[PDB]
Amino acid sequence: GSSGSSGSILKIEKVLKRMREIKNELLQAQNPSELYLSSKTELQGLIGQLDEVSLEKNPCIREARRRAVIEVQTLITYIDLKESGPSSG
């Protein structure tokens, strides 16, 4: 019994642990014109982990997981809306 390898909550905590960091690295970024590609790509990866804590026989899971999906997807989107734009204007 050695914590570190096992865990259903810790695996998720990370999905948000990095997400937060990224946001910052993006804000300070002067010319994120390129980050929009990396910053996003990385985000998508995180969510993937959530797949592990798939709908389990517990309320904390179904909730935590979901709440997390929207906590990470919110950024991935904010980027897409920023990337695209009107050619003229």
Swiss-Prot record:
Expressed in the heart. Residues 8-83 form the BAG domain. Co-chaperone for HSP/HSP70 proteins. It functions as a nucleotide-exchange factor promoting the release of ADP from HSP70, thereby activating HSP70-mediated protein refolding. Has an essential role in maintaining proteostasis at junctional membrane complexes (JMC), where it may function as a scaffold between the HSPA8 chaperone and JMC proteins enabling correct, HSPA8-dependent JMC protein folding. Inhibits both auto-ubiquitination of PRKN and ubiquitination of target proteins by PRKN. The fifth BAG domain is responsible for the interaction with HSP70 nucleotide-binding domain. Binds to the ATPase domain of HSP/HSP70 chaperones. Binds PRKN. Interacts with HSPA8 and JPH2. It is linked to Cardiomyopathy, dilated, 2F: A form of dilated cardiomyopathy, a disorder characterized by ventricular dilation and impaired systolic function, resulting in congestive heart failure and arrhythmia. Patients are at risk of premature death. CMD2F is an autosomal recessive, early-onset form. This is BAG family molecular chaperone regulator 5. It comes from Homo sapiens. The chain holds residues 275 to 350 of 447 of the full protein.
